[PDB]
Curated annotation (Swiss-Prot), chains A, B, C, D, E, F, G, H, I, J, K, L, M:
Gene this protein is translated from: sctF1
Complex formation: The core secretion machinery of the T3SS is composed of approximately 20 different proteins, including cytoplasmic components, a base, an export apparatus and a needle. This subunit polymerizes and forms the helical needle filament. Interacts with the needle tip protein SipD/SctA. Interacts with the needle adapter protein PrgJ/SctI, the secretin InvG/SctC and the minor export apparatus protein SpaP/SctR. In vitro, the needle protomer refolds spontaneously to extend the needle from the distal end.
Outcome following mutation: F16A: Can only secrete early substrates such as InvJ/ScpT, PrgJ/SctI and PrgI/SctF. Can polymerize into filaments in vitro, but not in vivo. Cannot enter cultured epithelial cells
Domain-level remarks: Deletion of the last five residues prevents self-association and yields monomeric proteins that allow biophysical studies. Forms a right-handed helical assembly with roughly 11 subunits per two turns. The location of the negatively charged surfaces are radically different among the needle filament proteins PrgI, BsaL and MxiH. In PrgI, the major negatively charged surface is not on the 'face' but instead is on the 'side' of the two-helix bundle, and only residues from helix alpha1 contribute to this negative region.
Functional summary from the UniProt entry: Component of the type III secretion system (T3SS), also called injectisome, which is used to inject bacterial effector proteins into eukaryotic host cells. PrgI/SctF1 forms the external needle filament that protrudes from the bacterial surface. Is probably involved in the transduction of an activating signal, thought to be mediated by the distal tip of the needle filament, to the secretion machine. Required for invasion of epithelial cells. Required for the secretion of the effector protein SptP.
Inactivation phenotype: The null mutant strain is non-invasive.
Designated name of the protein: SPI-1 type 3 secretion system needle filament protein
Record-level GO BP terms: protein secretion by the type III secretion system
Regulation: Binding of bile salts, including deoxycholate, to the PrgI:SipD interface may inhibit the T3SS function.
Amino acid sequence: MATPWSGYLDDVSAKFDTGVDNLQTQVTEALDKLAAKPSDPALLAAYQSKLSEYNLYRNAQSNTVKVFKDIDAAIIQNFR
Amino acid sequence: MATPWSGYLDDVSAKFDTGVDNLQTQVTEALDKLAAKPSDPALLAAYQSKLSEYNLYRNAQSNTVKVFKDIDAAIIQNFR
Amino acid sequence: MATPWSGYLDDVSAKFDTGVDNLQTQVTEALDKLAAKPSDPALLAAYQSKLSEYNLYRNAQSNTVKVFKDIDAAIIQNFR
Amino acid sequence: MATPWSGYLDDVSAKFDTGVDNLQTQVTEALDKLAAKPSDPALLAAYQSKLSEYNLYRNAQSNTVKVFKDIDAAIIQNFR
Amino acid sequence: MATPWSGYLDDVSAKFDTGVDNLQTQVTEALDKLAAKPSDPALLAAYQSKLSEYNLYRNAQSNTVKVFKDIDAAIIQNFR
Amino acid sequence: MATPWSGYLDDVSAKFDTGVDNLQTQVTEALDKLAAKPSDPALLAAYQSKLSEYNLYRNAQSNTVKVFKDIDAAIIQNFR
Amino acid sequence: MATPWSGYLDDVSAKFDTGVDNLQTQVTEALDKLAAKPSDPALLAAYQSKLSEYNLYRNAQSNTVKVFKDIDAAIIQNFR
Amino acid sequence: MATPWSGYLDDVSAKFDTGVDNLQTQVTEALDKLAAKPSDPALLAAYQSKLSEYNLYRNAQSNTVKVFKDIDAAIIQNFR
Amino acid sequence: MATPWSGYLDDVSAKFDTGVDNLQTQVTEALDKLAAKPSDPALLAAYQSKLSEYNLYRNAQSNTVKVFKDIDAAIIQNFR
Amino acid sequence: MATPWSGYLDDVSAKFDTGVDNLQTQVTEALDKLAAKPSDPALLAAYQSKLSEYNLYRNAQSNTVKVFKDIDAAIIQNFR
Amino acid sequence: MATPWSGYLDDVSAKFDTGVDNLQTQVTEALDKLAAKPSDPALLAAYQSKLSEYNLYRNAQSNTVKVFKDIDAAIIQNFR
Amino acid sequence: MATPWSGYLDDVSAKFDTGVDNLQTQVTEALDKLAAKPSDPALLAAYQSKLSEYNLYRNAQSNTVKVFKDIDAAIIQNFR
Amino acid sequence: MATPWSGYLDDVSAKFDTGVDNLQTQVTEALDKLAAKPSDPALLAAYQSKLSEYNLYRNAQSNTVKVFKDIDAAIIQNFR
């Protein structure tokens, strides 16, 4: 019944991850397989393709949170 | 009813493969046959011809995905 | 009769895209064809030529919007 | 109604073979006959004459495909 | 009355092709004939001579476009 | 009698171009000729030699303007 | 009972090596044997085949670690 | 129950050898016999015929592995 | 009285050609004569000897210009 | 009696050039001679050897000046 | 008690030579004898047989060292 | 009794060189000998083997120092 | 009393030539004699033997200088 506290920026992170929740799992499993056969073109292409997206999984995630935090700073900058 | 998640760059990879989905199968079967008779001019010519295309199956595939990812980086570079 | 809201920077994006609205379609169709025959010099040259322009379709687009936003920040920086 | 996939370089191979589709059959039948009477000057001359052409059936074939693939590499070398 | 959109780099490609528009046709027809008689010295010499030029038809074409795109990048690199 | 407005940085661009006003024309005409005969060593050498200079026609041009703009920013940074 | 400290990127390296832990041993033993008889086609083929994989044992290993470190930098880049 | 590790390129080597696993044995036994009677036309013809195939047993084998490794390099070349 | 514009790299090209201005003419005339009698040992030796130098007439020419352009890039790389 | 003004970074450039004042002259004269006989191994070796040093004549020169300018920026960055 | 320093690639060279340490001596002594009687079929066969192996004594040696150095470069290429 | 001043990065350079202090001497002496007999396979193999290590003597040396300097910059970047 | 300036890479060239200063003279004199009697086995053997070494007089010379220049580039690549 209890629910851990989550702020707005927390929610923003969740909102982004919602659409790419599977992305992490896919690229992780692609890594797991590729580790067994690094020389597999199929595993290389699949992993790298999903990894270039996983790059934004972290980058774009933190970027959007920053901006939503930046508009927070903008408001409290005028906190008369 | 469920469908695995696929990003834009994932879709780009699929879009390329769509037109050369058979290419992989053809050159694989050509390899399978050539393995039996490597000294067959017919199997050599067919396999090598389709293999020189299969070279782009991987190369050109990853190239187009990179570019579509590069314009992604270009945009988020200006992520004010 | 109703018209979706559009800001100045929105208009700037539209103004850029206006002159290259077809560019996206051309390079997309070039990709669609190239996918079928990646090994076609004609499709490679056409696609890559239009793709190097499509690079600016995203890059230069976001660049001009940034600048028009930067002069916005410059003004409100002096928002006494 | 269905048609097996064929790339550009595949088409190049077909384009060459089109003009020498019979060459293979002729030199094969010449071999078949010569096998029966290797000591026949007529079969030797005919077979060897068509065989020296069959030499290009494979050589020149793969050469032209290579070049058309080489200009493919040239283009994607500048795949910015 | 309508005219398909063409960018600067598109125009650059056209400008190059303008002077060698016939080159492609000549070497294609040379291939078509050579396919019929690969063992013809006349067709071999003519085709190969025009093919060594057709090598630049693709290579030099993409090279000049790259450079004109490179000076584009150079400018927008200073896009303050 | 009327003269279009030109700023300092505009003048800087003009000052650079003044010394290489012909450069653009020379390399353009070299391109025009080379397009006709790409396989001409003379046209290749002349064009490429002037093109490597034309590289700076754009690069160095925008570089000097940037710097003169950078010292502008430096001054107005202290615009008390 | 004690366990040496290992970071995430350390774990990433281990995760890759897990699937190719034997690869190193195989190619090392192949080298050891080949050293005795360099002129053995069997040892050459086996060693070189496993060596071309061992190329990725180091290359692909460090590549994946870099990327996982790159997304680390991406996050701390927004470390407000 | 245990199985030695094998990569993709390892599998490629095996896939080729699968179709010519007997080739090695045949030409080896042909050598063994020929060694006893080098002057036997039957042993010379049989051995040399199978040896010219054994030439590809090594050559074509390593060639196909190289290519499958080359497309591996192509992918990781774009390992952003 | 008027003199066409020439840059530094233009001057570099001229400086090289200065010492081999005659080389081009000599090997061209050697070609003209050889064309009449290709089977002349004297024309073959003279032409080929001067042609192997004419190889550098283009190669070494463009090489030195590149380097002088490379040190140009090196400087403007530090164009603070 | 009059002496042209020279700043610190000017002095830095002079300090570097002091030790390689002759380098420029040597490689220039080597070029002058090589231009006459490009096919001379002695002129090629001497010129190229001194040219690879002349590469640093410009590169390393501008590098050291940059650094001495960078520590200038570092100081005035704290110009309270 | 003192031991000269040896790097990894040094060790790699030693590891190869270990298995063919005698090869050099054998082919050297075969040369020494053959020098006395070049026309000896026995010395020719023995020397040439061991010389064709001595070919790899140098070639394959440097090849393996290169590769082990290449994976060194691969790692330090990602030396963030 | 007096000791020249040495910073941390100085110590880092020394720490690296400590393990390869002999490397420089070995490859220098190998060069000295090779200069006398460049055509000696033994001197070529030894020198080149130690030279490929000497490549890192400079490269890897400066790399590690850079990184230790980079973490210095990282700290003083937060020098509040 | 005056001594022409010489850089490190200059010294490297000299260091190599030191051990083969006579090589050039020997093979030059061998050429001079051979020119008189090209059909002399003694002059052919002597000249060709020293010429195959003179091949490295230029090749190996420039190779070692390149490497010593390459480690120069490696250092200044980290010229922070």
